[PDB]
Ligand binder design. Structure first.
Ligand SMILES: O=N[O-]
Ligand SMILES: O=N[O-]
Ligand SMILES: O=N[O-]
Ligand SMILES: O=N[O-]
Ligand SMILES: O=N[O-]
Ligand SMILES: O=N[O-]
Ligand SMILES: [Cu+2]
Ligand SMILES: [Cu+2]
Ligand SMILES: [Cu+2]
Ligand SMILES: [Cu+2]
Ligand SMILES: [Cu+2]
Ligand SMILES: [Cu+2]
Lengths: 333, 333, 333
């Protein structure tokens, strides 16, 4: 096919956990879907203590933004590395086929840009991440990863083939950071990326994250930035982990339909309490809220959640159902 | 519905790995199933060396007892915190919907009790655990977790829809403990829970358990407390891990039908050697014994099994089948 | 049945990642398939730094060779422990039923041999490993493990029941090593296995591998030993991990059909980016190559891959498909 005969549509990305507008069921034929991302190296404060790291981001955020297309669309990404950055970067899409997912074709020094196109031949949610030869885990674990959703052209389906339609979607990127520590246990600090590199490698080789966070920082998805829903709303939560296993859980709810390893041609697992998303994968869980109030959304290694950062909240509006749950006798002497 | 018109049935719980009597296929309509548990803080010796910790238990055991109901029964739990304990506790049921699984409604100080009711709307095995705000992983990793089984009303089914009926059931709770160590590697000791709390947090943050045990101690499911079966018996083994991934394996056998993430509306995985139960989940495996003798049941990280404690035994009675396995030439020079 | 009336066929094993010749669809009735393996304790250099360990092998390699039979064949293994070795060894087959998978029947001191027979009643890929009572994880994590494939008699099938036929097969064994370190972090060295045993236990109990490798060493499946394929070829990659979870990923490709936990009576998962093989399991992924060039095949904990060793390469010959992926604008200022 002459790709030049296909429609082009430009997407304007939004910062996680929000997701750019899209259609679940494709309203057109295949398209070339145009995306632009600008790499930004920046300092980020990642915990309540004020620990500041040198993050490596797509489009200024950890995680990078969720891209959404349909199966057999073409993804055309303009990737820009401004001259205000100092490192070489590239991009690997787990959704794509060939050239290490794109990384072999997209190496950009500061002051360069490139445009990659690939055909999104398989439906699912997938990780994308930077992957410069010889420095791959350093870039990934500095925050340089996100996800892409390739929807089936007729939207999502349950285990019986009937439609599943979400009302809201959120993207939770989970990031393991490896902040080097001195022998006494305090975080070190570094003056340039090259001076940091050996201690960053040492820190990674412990296989023990110092921080595990949603949306780039402890508490990022709490307070005025809590996720929201109403009773009766159908919510899809896309969750990615580019480097390390996680086990999401909605405290007070379930995954009614879960694609734990993210690929929509498979039937979903039903009624999950907790699911395993392997490192290097994106997964997706669908839930219909039945009760209002505060929910926590966590990695259910509870140490990882409550001590290292992998916990967010939902605030859910609506009526309380006492048939489903009630306090018969409130706590009393 | 007026819940007061439904039958009430009181269950009398038993200590793991045994399970209270129940019916696989429901012999009545929906019921309110009444349970009582009394929290007990107590010292427990957890290894052969004599290491003693301050455990936090439901009903005196690690794990807490397995509760069994049917789908769309109501679970009504009286939770008692006697004044001989010193901490605040609560309970979260992964089977329940709303109020953080019940934890928001069940906070009991020493000398208090409460009664929670919830509708068991989804079939499967599920974790329950204590979860006091701000202290969640400490209570869970002190032993304060168990499981609940919500059976389909017509019992279990295989991947084709035909019945699966167990003859025996056992509940294996697997517990990761994080006993603080000094710099030389010896376990520390503490005089009150408050004086222990910071070192307990430090220990948990290593993400490296010091002990990983079945039924509360190294060797608990061996010797006179080995699990038992006969050749030809169908056995269901429910396995939970409230905080950390595990990978069960029956050495010398299989999981003929496994719900690795524990939810019975899904077809089971067949013929598993080993399966992954993610932290925060209960799973269930069904096996029909074909050979007598000693079996080991383990977490198949063999370091976790044989060096840190995650190993039990079955002793199986009956006839040996030389067609299935035989020594053709016994070991000889 | 009188097993003596069945055909016997002797297999001549090959060194991983290659696999002995076999038929996917069984061309005969059930057989006794005869295998011989000779245990070899030997020094192995496992990284680019020259770190040398005392490995424990089946047939001289880490992993041991892949054995291939069909469902309801009998596996008859002659296991030889020459008097040039110094330890006791045995073998456990996860494919077998009874006697701890065979280990209770196959204990061989140096200078002894034994012959075990078992019926391969369940189709799938399975781990085998040494397991001497009281020393199990030491032998396994010294390299003493491999895998066996039990094919369905009518070969592999997709999720719809139609045939899947591979053109090439490779066996990737992934090995976690725990090389003891001194306080400063250098690898220690030991003069006899008995003098090494306590520090080996200490090292294992950290649960932190020092090395995680494919085919026995960093870089083993690269360069002149890269895996190979052509565009359009169907390749099955069998992957095992006898002790620790892994998450394989083909960088630039997919698992078109994956049995993550390795058991062929289950439908495969489709279109996987990454999959979890639990410790103690073998898995298998089927892929049809669509693009030429270099691919990396990794454990997608990228620290484990690129810093600790769990990375290999494919070199794929053929035509480039610019519809599937192209550089629209090559990197430029
Ligand atoms: O289910 N909450 O930890
Ligand atoms: O990959 N399916 O969940
Ligand atoms: O399969 N036993 O370690
Ligand atoms: O959740 N099903 O195994
Ligand atoms: O997908 N590569 O790291
Ligand atoms: O065990 N089935 O992938
Ligand atoms: Cu980068
Ligand atoms: Cu990747
Ligand atoms: Cu508690
Ligand atoms: Cu929980
Ligand atoms: Cu051995
Ligand atoms: Cu084993």
């Amino acid at each position: 096919v002459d790709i030049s005969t296909l429609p082009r549509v430009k997407v304007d990305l939004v910062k996680p956990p929000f997701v750019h507008a899209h259609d679940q069921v494709a309203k057109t034929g295949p398209r070339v879907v145009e995306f632009t991302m600008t790499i930004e190296e920046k300092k980020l404060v990642i915990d309540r203590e004020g620990t500041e790291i040198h993050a490596m981001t797509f489009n200024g955020s950890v995680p990078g933004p969720l891209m959404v297309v349909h199966e057999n669309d073409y993804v055309e990404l303009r990737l820009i590395n401004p001259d205000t950055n100092t490192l070489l970067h590239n991009i690997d899409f787990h959704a794509a086929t060939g050239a290490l997912g794109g990384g072999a074709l997209t190496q950009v020094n500061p002051g360069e840009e490139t445009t990659l196109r690939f055909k999104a031949t398989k439906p699912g949610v997938f990780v994308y991440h930077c992957a410069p030869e010889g420095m791959v885990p350093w870039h990934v674990t500095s925050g340089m990863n996100g996800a892409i959703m390739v929807l089936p052209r007729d939207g999502l389906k349950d285990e019986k083939g009937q439609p599943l339609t979400y009302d809201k979607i959120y993207y939770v990127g989970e990031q393991d950071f490896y902040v080097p520590k001195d022998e006494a246990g305090n975080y070190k600090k570094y003056e340039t990326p090259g001076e940091a590199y050996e201690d960053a490698v040492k820190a990674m080789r412990t296989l023990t994250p110092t921080h595990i966070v949603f949306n780039g920082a402890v508490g990022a998805l709490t307070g005025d930035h809590a996720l929201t829903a109403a009773v009766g709303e159908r919510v899809l939560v896309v969750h990615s982990q580019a480097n390390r296993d996680t086990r999401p859980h909605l405290i007070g709810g379930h995954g009614d339909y879960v694609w734990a390893t993210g690929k929509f041609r498979n039937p979903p697992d039903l009624d999950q309490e907790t699911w395993l998303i392997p490192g290097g994968t994106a997964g997706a869980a669908f839930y219909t809220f039945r009760q209002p109030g505060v929910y926590a959304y966590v990695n259910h290694n509870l140490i990882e959640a409550f001590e290292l950062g992998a916990a967010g909240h939902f605030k859910v509006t609506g009526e309380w159902n006492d048939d489903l749950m009630t306090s018969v006798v409130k706590p009393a002497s």
